[PDB]
Amino acid sequence: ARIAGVEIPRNKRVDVALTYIYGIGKARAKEALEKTGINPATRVKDLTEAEVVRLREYVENTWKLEGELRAEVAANIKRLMDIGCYRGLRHRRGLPVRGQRTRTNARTRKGPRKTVAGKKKAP
Amino acid sequence: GKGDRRTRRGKIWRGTYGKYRPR
Amino acid sequence: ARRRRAEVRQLQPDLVYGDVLVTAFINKIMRDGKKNLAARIFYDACKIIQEKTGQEPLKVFKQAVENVKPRMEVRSRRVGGANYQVPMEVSPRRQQSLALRWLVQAANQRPERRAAVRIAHELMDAAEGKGGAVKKKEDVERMAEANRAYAHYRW
Amino acid sequence: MKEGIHPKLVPARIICGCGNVIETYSTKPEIYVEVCSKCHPFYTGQQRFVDTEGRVERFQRRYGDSYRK
RNA sequence: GGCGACACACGUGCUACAAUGCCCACUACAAAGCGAUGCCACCCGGCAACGGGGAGCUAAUCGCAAAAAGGUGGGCCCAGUUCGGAUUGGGGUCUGCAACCCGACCCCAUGAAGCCGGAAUCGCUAGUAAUCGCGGAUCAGCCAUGCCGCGGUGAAUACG
RNA sequence: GCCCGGAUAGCUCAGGGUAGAGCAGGGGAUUGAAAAUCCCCGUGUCCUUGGUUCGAUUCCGAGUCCGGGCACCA
RNA sequence: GCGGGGUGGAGCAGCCUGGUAGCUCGUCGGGCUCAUAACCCGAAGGUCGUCGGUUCAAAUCCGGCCCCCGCAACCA
RNA sequence: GCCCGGAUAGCUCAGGGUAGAGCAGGGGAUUGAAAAUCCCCGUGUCCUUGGUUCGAUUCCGAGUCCGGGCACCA
Ligand SMILES: [K+]
Ligand SMILES: [Mg+2]
Ligand SMILES: [Mg+2]
Ligand SMILES: [Mg+2]
Ligand SMILES: [Mg+2]
Ligand SMILES: [Mg+2]
Ligand SMILES: [Mg+2]
Ligand SMILES: [Mg+2]
Ligand SMILES: [Mg+2]
Ligand SMILES: [Mg+2]
Ligand SMILES: [Mg+2]
Ligand SMILES: [Mg+2]
Ligand SMILES: [Mg+2]
Ligand SMILES: [Mg+2]
Ligand SMILES: [Mg+2]
Ligand SMILES: [Mg+2]
Ligand SMILES: [Mg+2]
Ligand SMILES: [Mg+2]
Ligand SMILES: [Mg+2]
Ligand SMILES: [Mg+2]
Ligand SMILES: [Mg+2]
Ligand SMILES: [Mg+2]
Ligand SMILES: [Mg+2]
Ligand SMILES: [Mg+2]
Ligand SMILES: [Mg+2]
Ligand SMILES: [Mg+2]
Ligand SMILES: [Mg+2]
Ligand SMILES: [Mg+2]
Ligand SMILES: [Mg+2]
Ligand SMILES: [Mg+2]
Ligand SMILES: [Mg+2]
Ligand SMILES: [Mg+2]
Ligand SMILES: [Mg+2]
Ligand SMILES: [Mg+2]
Ligand SMILES: [Mg+2]
Ligand SMILES: [Mg+2]
Ligand SMILES: [Mg+2]
Ligand SMILES: [Zn+2]
């Protein structure tokens, strides 16, 4: 487990590799490398352990990441449910939270179609 | 892609500007 | 086309090799009307067939075309209680269309990463009689030969 | 101990990113580690990292008492 | 408050599954329209949505304006990826009396399904189809990917 | 007279926490109006009695209205 | 008295030989059709009558109870 | 117990220098549907072992195992 808790992929560039960490999008990648002064274009295989620890030390202390971030995200959702606002209610039943229609679609939140019998027609 | 707001092409599609597409 | 024959389009001969058949080939490479992009590929493939196996690209291309030309094919027809698979000979116009169409089709099924390479390599194999587009052409001719029983049903 | 089946434990030095150095015994002579006891947030004081937040919310919100009196 | 519901089912579409592609920088070539509590040049603050300033135009003059695909340079190297951008956390902006139900944006983070789609089925015969961007009407704002239009690039095939 | 089985809405019948279907009747959607289909409502001391159980249409014990079977003899 | 049988809604495999529940129809969703049927593409539904036992494991092997069919009941 | 047989691809069967064909499966052409037809492709120590040969599914010694066949049973 190199950094933060994860092993970022060798043979790809640092700026891309950092993104594989939960909590680092491409934007935080560019800024971290700038702030610690490492080339964004250097393959992970080709970093001095000096570069490794410098990049490592920065990233973990600057932002909350991986598990801790997930936990903090979890506490937020948990809070909404417990109070419990309409937003919290939506998380209970696993419906969309941001005002999307549910007559159709919503498959990402609702999941696979549970097909059901319809209404029969006359003969 | 055009549905990606976090890109030039995406901001063009939505007809808006920002960091990812400046004016 | 009930009333009359369709006018066969005449295409502007390409600027580099000055060949109409090249133009038609450029068109089969063209997706979404990006002719400029498609023209590059063909010409860049021409660069590649130039350096690998040092022949004149134009002679290689033209040869590959002739080899993928199907002399015979099956064409569905009529007749009352069933629709037969009848062996018909292929018109020079249709011969040309098919080979160009297949050439691209086989080219885009090759494993190489970039387009100019795929085109060049398929053109190379096709000129030497190997290659996917050729395999289709032989397949088509086998089916035609096979259904010789229903020859008299031809028009 | 049984001959032939066990791997030799030798003097070994384990090195952390925080410059910590540990003198111990291992199958490997030298080993480099990302973290150790000496620098791990839970171990070191309470080095609360990025999260001082607790949590904050909700009525650290303030900003302000502007709605009138 | 509801018309915005959601175990489900259908239509019409949008965005994709990638290298004839994606990205960043740089550099070109349209047309038709719209515009006085309107369009807003340019300056500065903000990564930014925007905000404060602040000229010009009652407009073949001033502005919306950058057209985009393209062209040039470099990066990515076949990976559920720098493909895709749904979903969700957080922080902001603007219109508006007011964005909980139920607005559009911007930014950080998240980065789902999707590897070209069963039976079946649609459109188009030429500047057409495909693809690329632009404008308007409605309108405070806007759920427009809709509609009506405008140009850019530009095919394949018709034996019968 | 002797063993086994059904009693549940007006009809015909499903089936340990006073329960349903159809059909009949009433509405309603559909329709030009009907049929059909779809939706909604009323439907009941769940045969009598004793028992078990906090609790019985439900499990038991019988009994009852009725349904299949048993019956000189040489 | 003796033999066979009970398994998706219907009718039948699977048991003999313990480990894996299958076939046709029906039902549900979707196609074709102006529409229905036929037809074509997908999907759901059986813890095997019950209880007890053997076993690591029972639709399957052994018992017990409830059914449901069938054959027998002769000499006087 | 003795003779006569076999084993070859998922199935069915054909044969000193060889590895087959028919169907199953896969894709494609064809279509209302189901087939039919057509083109391509997949499926082996030719049971095991030990030998002959320059080498063998092939010849042979051989064991395993289903084929058959014929006799006998105190
Ligand atoms: K007698
Ligand atoms: Mg990340
Ligand atoms: Mg909604
Ligand atoms: Mg992207
Ligand atoms: Mg020791
Ligand atoms: Mg509506
Ligand atoms: Mg749409
Ligand atoms: Mg307007
Ligand atoms: Mg993924
Ligand atoms: Mg997936
Ligand atoms: Mg990605
Ligand atoms: Mg939010
Ligand atoms: Mg709102
Ligand atoms: Mg791929
Ligand atoms: Mg595609
Ligand atoms: Mg026409
Ligand atoms: Mg596109
Ligand atoms: Mg538009
Ligand atoms: Mg508007
Ligand atoms: Mg919306
Ligand atoms: Mg009426
Ligand atoms: Mg009683
Ligand atoms: Mg009495
Ligand atoms: Mg049953
Ligand atoms: Mg049955
Ligand atoms: Mg059967
Ligand atoms: Mg049996
Ligand atoms: Mg068995
Ligand atoms: Mg049906
Ligand atoms: Mg009519
Ligand atoms: Mg039908
Ligand atoms: Mg039993
Ligand atoms: Mg048992
Ligand atoms: Mg079992
Ligand atoms: Mg048992
Ligand atoms: Mg013998
Ligand atoms: Mg066989
Ligand atoms: Zn340490």
From Swiss-Prot, chain A:
Transmembrane regions: none
One function term, GO molecular function aspect: structural constituent of ribosome
One example of a Gene Ontology biological process annotation: translation
PROSITE patterns documented for this protein: RIBOSOMAL_S13_1, RIBOSOMAL_S13_2
Subunit structure: Part of the 30S ribosomal subunit. Forms a loose heterodimer with protein S19. Forms two bridges to the 50S subunit in the 70S ribosome, contacting protein L5 and the 23S rRNA; these bridges are straddled by the 5S rRNA.
Function: Located at the top of the head of the 30S subunit, it contacts several helices of the 16S rRNA. In the 70S ribosome structure it contacts the 23S rRNA (bridge B1a) and protein L5 of the 50S subunit (bridge B1b), connecting the top of the two subunits; these bridges are in contact with the A site and P site tRNAs respectively and are implicated in movement during ribosome translocation. Separately contacts the tRNAs in the A and P sites.
Protein name (database record): Small ribosomal subunit protein uS13
Organism name: Thermus thermophilus (strain ATCC 27634 / DSM 579 / HB8)
From Swiss-Prot, chain B:
One MF annotation (Gene Ontology) recorded for this entry: rRNA binding
Region annotated Disordered, chain positions: 1-23
Gene Ontology CC annotations of this record: ribonucleoprotein complex; ribosome
Keyword Isomerase found: no
Record field: compositional bias (Basic residues): 1-12
Pfam family, one: Thx
Alphabetized UniProt keyword annotations: Ribonucleoprotein, Ribosomal protein, RNA-binding, rRNA-binding
Subunit note: Part of the 30S ribosomal subunit.
Family in the record: Belongs to the bacterial ribosomal protein bTHX family.
The protein's role, per its UniProt record: Binds at the top of the head of the 30S subunit. It stabilizes a number of different RNA elements and thus is important for subunit structure.
NCBIfam families assigned to the protein according to its UniProt record, in alphabetical order: PRK14753.1, ribo_THX
Annotated protein name in UniProt: Small ribosomal subunit protein bTHX
From Swiss-Prot, chain C:
This protein's name: Small ribosomal subunit protein uS7
SUPFAM superfamilies to which the protein is assigned, alphabetical: Ribosomal protein S7
Function statement: One of the primary rRNA binding proteins, it binds directly to 3'-end of the 16S rRNA where it nucleates assembly of the head domain of the 30S subunit. Is located at the subunit interface close to the decoding center. Binds mRNA and the E site tRNA blocking its exit path in the ribosome. This blockage implies that this section of the ribosome must be able to move to release the deacetylated tRNA.
Subunit organization: Part of the 30S ribosomal subunit. Contacts proteins S9 and S11. Binds to the C-terminus of IF3 and to the C-terminus of Era.
GO molecular function, one term: tRNA binding
Similarity remark: Belongs to the universal ribosomal protein uS7 family.
UniProt xrefs under CDD domains: uS7_Bacteria
Protein species of origin: Thermus thermophilus (strain ATCC 27634 / DSM 579 / HB8)
Entries under Pfam families matching the protein: Ribosomal_S7 (PF00177)
PANTHER family recorded: RIBOSOMAL PROTEIN S7
Keywords from the UniProt entry: Ribonucleoprotein, Ribosomal protein, RNA-binding, rRNA-binding, tRNA-binding
GO biological process assignments: translation
Organism lineage string: Bacteria, Thermotogati, Deinococcota, Deinococci, Thermales
Entry keyword Zinc: no
GO CC annotation: small ribosomal subunit
Curated annotation (Swiss-Prot), chain D:
Gene Ontology terms describing biological process: translation
Domain of life, per lineage: Bacteria
Assigned keywords, A-Z: Metal-binding, Ribonucleoprotein, Ribosomal protein, RNA-binding, rRNA-binding, Zinc
Function: Binds the 23S rRNA.
Protein name, UniProt field: Large ribosomal subunit protein bL31
Record organism: Thermus thermophilus (strain ATCC 27634 / DSM 579 / HB8)
One GO cellular component, as annotated: ribonucleoprotein complex
Keyword Protein transport recorded: no
Assembly with partners or alone: Part of the 50S ribosomal subunit.
Gene3D superfamilies, per database record: Ribosomal protein L31
Cofactor (UniProt): Zn(2+)
